[PDB]
Amino acid sequence: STAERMLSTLTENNYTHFTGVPCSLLKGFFRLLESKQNITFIPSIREDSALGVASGMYLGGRKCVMLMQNSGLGYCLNVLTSFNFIYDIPILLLISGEKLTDLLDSVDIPYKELDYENSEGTILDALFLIEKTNRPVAILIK
């Protein structure tokens, strides 16, 4: 459903590479990623490793996104602030509130909130901003 509607837009915008840690909150997207259309998914032990793998994939000339949860954000923080915002390696972050965006803008990572009926206006706003920035921008979920 909402899951497939997302994936299709990304997969035909050349976003066929995804990393993340398996976890209950976004279970359906891991479901679909290992269901099947050619997609490459790299299961990761921890979020910082998922970010590193995604950044390496990007260096391989491949646009990619990492699925995660709020609790993992801490682990990636230094990476994002010391690597992708320094090398300008854009990764889309679909991070799945007050505290979260306070922290984000304190360390300066653009974020948006997805509305479920209007999936693409949030994700395409985010894609446009990463095109302008060549830096990671976050898409937020419940």
């Binding site: 790299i42 000339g61 491949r62 230094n78």
Partner: protein
């Protein structure tokens, strides 16, 4: 054999490989030895050289890729090996420059690399005439070095990115 010698050894063994060097003395040493456009230097993010290299070897499975870790960067993100050993990239070379004399020691690294699924793992203590390495990775190279300089690396991270990815793109598909 210091880190200078070990990095020159690795370069002489993989002249055409893309190198991802962990931050610190290893990146500075590699830059001073031979700043090639195929060297991707890390300015920080200790523990991320191996993940970035794994992603690169995923997208480009047929090109040789050398990750240059130290004992510190290796131990800080040891879990990466589980993914490296599961994905099994065939042209991936994990070098661990280990200057252990105070710290958590690096013990049985080759055995553990083999345990998690690496294709081979060897240890080098001194300069050898040759060593035969199986051409199919993933392979770990544990090199014991004794520390002993060098101009600070003068490329902005964005320039590093551009040179490195340009080399990658033009020497494969185009």
């Amino acid at each position: 054999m210091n880190k200078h010698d070990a990095i020159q050894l690795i370069l002489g063994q993989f002249p055409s490989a893309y190198l991802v060097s962990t931050c610190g003395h290893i990146s500075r040493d590699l830059y001073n030895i031979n700043d090639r456009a195929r060297n991707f230097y890390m300015v920080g993010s200790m523990g991320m050289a191996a993940p970035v290299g794994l992603g690169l070897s995923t997208v480009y499975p047929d090109v040789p890729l050398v990750v240059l870790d130290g004992d510190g960067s290796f131990l800080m993100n040891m879990g990466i090996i589980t993914m490296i050993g599961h994905q099994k990239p065939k042209n991936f070379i994990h070098v661990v420059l280990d200057n252990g004399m105070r710290t958590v020691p690096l013990v049985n690294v080759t055995d553990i690399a083999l345990q998690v699924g690496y294709e081979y793992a060897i240890e080098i203590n001194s300069g050898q005439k040759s060593f035969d390495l199986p051409n199919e990775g993933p392979g770990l190279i544990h090199i014991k070095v004794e520390p002993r300089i060098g101009k600070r690396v003068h490329w902005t991270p964005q320039e590093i990115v551009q040179r490195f990815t340009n080399e990658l793109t033009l020497e494969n598909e185009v």
